[PDB]
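Lecture 7, part B: from sequences to assemblies.

Below are the input chains for today's worked example.
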Amino acid sequence: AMLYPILTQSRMLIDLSGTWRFKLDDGSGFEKKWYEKTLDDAQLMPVPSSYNDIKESADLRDHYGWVFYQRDLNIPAYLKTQRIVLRFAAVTHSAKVYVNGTLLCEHKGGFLPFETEIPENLIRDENLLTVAVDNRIDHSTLPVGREDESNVLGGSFFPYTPTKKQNKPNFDFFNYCGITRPVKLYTTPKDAYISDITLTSSLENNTARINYKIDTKGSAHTAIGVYTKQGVCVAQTENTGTEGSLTIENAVLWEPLKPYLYEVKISFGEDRYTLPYGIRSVAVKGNKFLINNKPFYFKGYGKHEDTFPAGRGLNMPMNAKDISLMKWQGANSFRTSHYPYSEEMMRLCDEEGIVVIDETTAVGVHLNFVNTFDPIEQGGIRTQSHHKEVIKDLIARDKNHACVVMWSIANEADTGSKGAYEYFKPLFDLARELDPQKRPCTLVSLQMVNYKEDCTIKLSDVFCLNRYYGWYTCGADLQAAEKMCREELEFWNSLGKPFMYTEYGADTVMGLHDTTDSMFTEEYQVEYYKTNHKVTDTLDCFIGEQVWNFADFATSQGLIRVQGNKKGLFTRDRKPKLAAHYFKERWSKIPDFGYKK
Amino acid sequence: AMLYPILTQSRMLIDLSGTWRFKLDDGSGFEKKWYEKTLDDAQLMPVPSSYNDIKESADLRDHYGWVFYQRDLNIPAYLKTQRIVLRFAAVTHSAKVYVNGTLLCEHKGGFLPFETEIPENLIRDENLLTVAVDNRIDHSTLPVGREDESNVLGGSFFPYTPTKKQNKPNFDFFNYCGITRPVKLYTTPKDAYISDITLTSSLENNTARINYKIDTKGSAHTAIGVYTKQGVCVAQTENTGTEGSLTIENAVLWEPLKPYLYEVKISFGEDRYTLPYGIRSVAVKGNKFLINNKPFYFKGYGKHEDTFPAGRGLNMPMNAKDISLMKWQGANSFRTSHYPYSEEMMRLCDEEGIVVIDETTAVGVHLNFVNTFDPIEQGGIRTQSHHKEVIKDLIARDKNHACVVMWSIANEADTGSKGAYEYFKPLFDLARELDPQKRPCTLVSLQMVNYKEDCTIKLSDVFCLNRYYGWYTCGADLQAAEKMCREELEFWNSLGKPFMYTEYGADTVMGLHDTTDSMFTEEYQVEYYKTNHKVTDTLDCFIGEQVWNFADFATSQGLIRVQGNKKGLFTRDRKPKLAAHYFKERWSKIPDFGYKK
Ligand SMILES: [Cl-]
Ligand SMILES: [Cl-]
Ligand SMILES: [Cl-]
Ligand SMILES: [Cl-]
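Predicted structure of the full complex, as structure tokens:
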């Protein structure tokens, strides 16, 4: 259970972000127990931020292993009358958290929150908070790191021996690590408090019924009230226990680009918590993706959390800039490729009416780009257990978001190979079991020669395809790209279920131009997209287009990465390429609902 | 025999360059004998120029097969008292030349001149000159085109069927074709004229002895005179026949960056011809490359003939700009990668004191990047016969240039495989036989794991290496690049013979930057070069550094070509990247002679 920490009449909220001490592990930090004392001979690092790009050091950017963050934590003893909690919104990839040299918690998974109470007895007059952060990835982590597998995107013409041991990402984006999202101290009443809130809605005529389950610790009485934005109470139930329901007459529905959030206020004993909440329905019916019973057409992007110089770190001005650009362009949606995004972004999307495909950290689950899904004993991928935990934690965090309409279980896994169905079926079953709203589930399909053998066909409610007709195949032959595109997409269209692009694009360096089709130029990016839409616009089961990518982003180094991935419609500093203007024109003429009715 | 056409007291020179008619072959141009009539429904094309980039049409740029050029040729009948010659400086790749629907000549080889007399009887009051130009390349052409071999640099992740049949270059640079260099009509006396001039020099104390052989047609008397730039006669011999010698007291030697050209004036009957000529010696001795008996250090580049929009076409303002930039940067030399350059450039290098490594068209002689040098019956490369002709014609054209100090027999052939020595030994023997000055010969060595098996070791006077330590291997690991560089180059240094870099570089997009080593940025280009020089500056047999490339240039399309090849020190419009300033500083501090003495 991970409610977003907020300031309330029963809950303090103390941000610990700022300038922290920082030290690379030299192989002796745990042996010499650096967490027991002030870090010596240390640097300074902003928190929240990825650490890789803050300095000018390749040894720091390309570090392998642990680093140690630390700050002083001097708090009033009178907080000891309350329950005291340290919340880590995200520490990438793995964390060990120490207060005064006592290990308080550990966490695996770099993109979801975790928390620990501080035992009263540990809090001295002066305290040290130390966070050790591990950046290493392998066959057991999500995202996956290679072990003996070859570098496909960053391969040399002639092999060489690396100077130092390094991570081997099985994914494109740069392995930004550190204290990615805010660290905060918060409090709740000690004896009785709210641990979780679950809300589902049903629309009977113009009356919404909101079913609630309020999970609590301790013995007290539970109450719930639903308020309009302007502050009018529209439903209230007292002494309701855990489960109940209530109704809102003439409810205002949350719609894409037309958001409406009620405020759901909960009391339990002395505890107070307010959750914003939008009322909307999601259903797949035939080849339609229905939001509030209307056939939606996705217009948008796969994104990354990527800005300079914080890397993956929470950047709230850029989040607001990015949503503004989305509305400027006529987009209505994006996918959280390839990890859960910050709660601050997710809550902002609820407020702004941006639809979200919420995706796990499960990218790189692919050992043949020994079978990927062989038994662990025979060398198969070792991620399924953690994959289950990620699904649990992602849905627990994001279940109440109106903006989340579909779960993406994995990106570009080896879904055309033997054992893939056996790996994924329990994960799809888990997502359907745990999501109270029973939203659609998908996996994001890698381009593959044997596409009819993609186990997505047996599992997903929507088929989500990553396809690069005119880039990774048919480059500079867009007539051949159109023919190859049509041949495959007519197969998917024949299945009668909704399908969409979750990735399609062409690397494009701003400022490169040619009137005559030429890879990496701004004009070719436009022609690539025109060619694909010639096909997709004729297919009635094709219900959405999300480009790769919203913006240029950092990646590992190699011969096909021109200082990162250049498939953005915008540059890394959010400037529009020619194709950004193309999509503004195109999306201006396509309705959010009823394009393919 | 191909003397450069000049205006003299016995020789008219009439340039036919300008706007010509132009038509793509549609498969019927020879059947319908388009050369017999004015081209119908034709476009217009500048001559000289490559045709590929003049318009905005991909079908034109990527044309496969023949095109037809044509112009009117209305000349005075009184020229019929003279011998009338049509000179094609270069037609890329193969040509058929028609006057009034009579086929006058055909030529194979896109980068060397050819000529034909016009029979008096064919010249009507009004005439048509038609040039059919073939762009097709295969296992029998230089440069080599692939037939069934795979595309290594421009390969897709997923195979596709091309829309139309296209050339398959076995080389990086774009396959620019057309009437690349000027077409001119010239005249000589009919009955007796000079066909060729051969000069060699010997330095006895401060006296130069110039040995001459004047090849003529007809019966007349031969005379030769050598004049200073200011016009003083310094040697003269009359009625000398074909072979002879003469001496120049206190001769001014041609030196790199300090050129001096005498004027050698020849008369034969009524014919007059003037050849510029620099006096200098070239010899390899031990690990030294001696120009005028002093140990030279090459500083410069592999170039291309490449500008926008003419492609490969002769661009005389840019030739002068390029030499000016070379002198600005402190360079002393370049290689004509990967084909003979225009006579206008070669004569300008003589005038300006730029040293030249003169290279054949033999790039792509490599079928395993069936053995490359298997017998033709078993599928081996079919180029050796034409390769011999190219060597003959290149040396015949350029033998008298002081600026030419070494012949490059081939670039990046399969010289580490069986049969390579057997293929190349006759070609090296031919070059040594035909060059009157017996200049050094080399081949330019591809980077290869089995470098000790490179047959260059058995054939070349100088070992010329193309090496990409820190780009195609060890990318973004320059410490590993330095170690791998040193390990291999210490082998070459142990052989005791002169060796050099003819290629080394890193793709660099102007305007991309990072303080921290990152491929494709301007800073990484500098660090790449610093790392390599750390090694080469410590090796006493390493006698020269020529970067890849002088300037960004156009290539085929593919995932590793960011709108062409970006390894230029300068952009395509000749603007300096950071590394251009690095080399200006570095070469400013390295003498042309006696750096490694
Ligand atoms: Cl990615
Ligand atoms: Cl991509
Ligand atoms: Cl090239
Ligand atoms: Cl290259």
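Note for the exam: Residues 478-494 of chain B form the longest helix (17 residues). Keep this in mind when comparing with the next example.
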